[PDB]
Curated annotation (Swiss-Prot), chain A:
Topology in membrane: Peripheral membrane protein
Family matches, as SUPFAM superfamilies: ATP synthase (F1-ATPase), gamma subunit
Protein name per the record: ATP synthase gamma chain
Cell membrane found in the keyword field: yes
GO biological process, one term: proton motive force-driven ATP synthesis
From Swiss-Prot, chain B:
Keyword Ligase: no
Keywords: ATP synthesis, ATP-binding, Cell membrane, CF(1), Hydrogen ion transport, Ion transport, Membrane, Nucleotide-binding, Translocase, Transport
Residue span relative to the full protein: 237 to 470 of 471
GO molecular function: ATP binding; ATP hydrolysis activity; proton-transporting ATP synthase activity, rotational mechanism
Record carries keyword Amino-acid biosynthesis: no
UniProt name for this protein: ATP synthase subunit beta
Function: Produces ATP from ADP in the presence of a proton gradient across the membrane. The catalytic sites are hosted primarily by the beta subunits.
GO cellular component, one term: plasma membrane
Family membership: Belongs to the ATPase alpha/beta chains family.
Gene name tied to this protein: atpD
Protein's cellular compartments: Cell membrane
Top-level taxon: Bacteria
Complexes and interactors: F-type ATPases have 2 components, CF(1) - the catalytic core - and CF(0) - the membrane proton channel. CF(1) has five subunits: alpha(3), beta(3), gamma(1), delta(1), epsilon(1). CF(0) has four main subunits: a(1), b(1), b'(1) and c(9-12).
Organism for this UniProt entry: Chloroflexus aurantiacus (strain ATCC 29366 / DSM 635 / J-10-fl)
Length: 285, 234
């Protein structure tokens, strides 16, 4: 506080404000393109949604409700999927999703179900490595526009684990994009338990050339992979939105601190001028 | 006081705003035609200060337990009067405007407050360890203050985040209701013995009370009162 250190501080926080505003702008463009990608992925997702509803409408017997469609009893092992940002600055989003994952692990262990972690994004990977859980499936360096082929390394592993009895149920934790400003973590069930939607009510009778059971066993894994891809893209959009909000708040805070530091600098400047003129007047007299 | 000190009686000496002693000296010196030193202060500032303060001493015949108060012009701690006072003390306490504005009314700044007998041989090893840890943690928070201010709490590491939360709890916990200040804060005064203070802060640093929200450390006695308040709040 010597009217020169405060000047350096003011310059520093001004640089912070400029960098943060630039981050907010690029995060806005990122959110735009991520929303575009989500909407471009929407047709596959919803078409397969009503296709699955129609298929499970016909497959109603317990005997043929096997493989991925079976509603297993006496659940023993549960796998949860977590999608997290690869980088920080997201604000409370990473903390929120990891708190949700931790508490969900708490209830799943409360009922006696052993839990295994499958993580997208470096933040969740690092957190779960530090806390103790070894990543059963690890996938990082997912860009803002990931391809479905990039998720296979985890999704196929989870589906094979469920098929082999390793996991009796499957979950995903992702950041839902409620608004441009408001985002919460969400929980979804990955064992199908499909909805008796209008499609399920639809009685359009079909023909299954390779076979009903074969079509079922070939479409359930792809439906699950589509759900995971939707969740990952939703999480990417929420990541960019949360970074936008965090950087807007940081820019506003930096501007407020620049204002306060400018007030302090002006006070120091006036004090320095008063001190020097008082000393000069004393020396003259 | 010196008469009673010399005959062996233990004396408690309370002098208020030694700064007005220095200020009156400055005004008298200005009227006396002396050349002003630094900020309009008397050239004989150190000598007058020493003449007053070297008589405030516990000698072999008897002891004086002096407990002064000092007013810093506005919030200036580099002013010549407190600057000369600081070297004339065994225990220094600094009251900050910012802490008082937060209603943490005892308002003592732990980082700017020191004492000569904060040594494990005199005050005890556990007391010294707890105090030094409560200053280290307080420092970490002062270093991360700007990082928290602009960016936010989430960019800190997990251990930095934990130490920041513990530092805020410690700041709130130094608040204490006083019997004489019952008019301002409706809470009755609390007399916390030094042993209970050491135990409370050792428990706070150990990790106990981490789950408690920081709002329950405000204007409480020892850690047991905080635990009781939390339990009553469930």
């Amino acid at each position: 506080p010597s009217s020169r250190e405060i000047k350096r501080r003011i310059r520093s926080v001004k640089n912070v404000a400029q960098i943060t505003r630039a981050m907010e702008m690029v995060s806005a463009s990122k959110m735009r393109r991520a929303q575009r990608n989500v909407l471009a992925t929407r047709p596959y997702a919803d078409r397969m949604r009503e296709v699955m509803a129609n298929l499970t409408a016909r497959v109603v017997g317990a005997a043929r409700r096997g493989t991925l469609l079976e509603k297993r009893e006496t659940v023993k092992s549960v796998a949860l999927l977590v999608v997290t940002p690869d980088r920080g600055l997201c604000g409370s989003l990473v903390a929120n999703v990891l708190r949700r994952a931790g508490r969900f692990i708490t209830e799943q262990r409360a009922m006696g179900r052993t839990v295994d972690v499958y993580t997208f994004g470096r933040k969740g990977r690092d957190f779960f490595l530090r806390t103790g859980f070894a990543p059963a499936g690890e996938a990082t360096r997912l860009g803002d526009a990931p391809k479905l082929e990039a998720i296979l390394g985890v999704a196929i592993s989870a589906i094979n684990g469920f098929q082999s009895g390793k996991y009796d149920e499957l979950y995903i934790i992702y950041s839902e994009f409620i608004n441009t400003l408001v985002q919460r973590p969400a929980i979804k069930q990955l064992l199908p338990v499909e909805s008796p939607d209008i499609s399920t009510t639809t009685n359009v009778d079909y023909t299954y050339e390779p076979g009903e059971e074969e079509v079922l066993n070939s479409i359930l894994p792809r439906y699950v992979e589509t759900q995971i891809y939707q969740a990952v893209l939703e999480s990417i959009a929420s990541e960019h939105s949360a970074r936008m909000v965090a950087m807007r708040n940081a820019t506003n805070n930096a501007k407020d601190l620049v204002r306060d530091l400018t007030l302090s600098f002006n006070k120091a400047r006036q004090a320095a001028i008063t001190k020097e003129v008082s000393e000069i007047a004393s020396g003259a007299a | 006081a010196e008469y009673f000190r010399d005959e062996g009686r233990d004396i408690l000496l309370f002098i208020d705003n030694i700064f007005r002693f220095v200020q009156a000296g400055s005004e008298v010196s200005s009227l006396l035609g002396r050349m002003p030193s630094q900020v309009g202060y008397q050239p004989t500032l150190g000598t007058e200060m020493g003449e007053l303060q070297e008589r405030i001493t516990s000698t072999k015949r008897g002891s004086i337990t002096s407990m002064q108060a000092v007013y810093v012009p506005a919030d200036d701690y580099t002013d010549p009067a407190p600057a000369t006072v600081f070297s004339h003390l065994d225990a220094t306490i600094s009251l900050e405007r910012s802490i008082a504005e937060r209603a943490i009314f005892p308002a003592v700044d732990p980082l700017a407050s020191t004492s000569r007998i904060l040594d494990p041989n005199i005050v005890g090893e556990e007391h010294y360890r707890v105090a030094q840890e409560v200053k280290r943690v307080l420092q970490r928070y002062k270093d991360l203050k700007d990082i928290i201010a602009i960016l936010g709490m989430e960019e800190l590491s997990d251990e930095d985040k934990l130490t920041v939360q513990r530092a805020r709890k410690i700041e709130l916990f130094f608040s204490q209701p006083f019997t004489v200040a019952q008019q301002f804060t409706g809470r009755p005064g609390k007399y916390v013995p030094v042993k209970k203070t050491v135990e409370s802060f050792a428990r706070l640093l150990n990790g106990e009370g981490d789950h408690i929200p920081e709002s329950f450390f405000y204007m409480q006695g020892d850690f047991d009162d905080v635990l009781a308040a939390y339990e009553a709040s469930q």
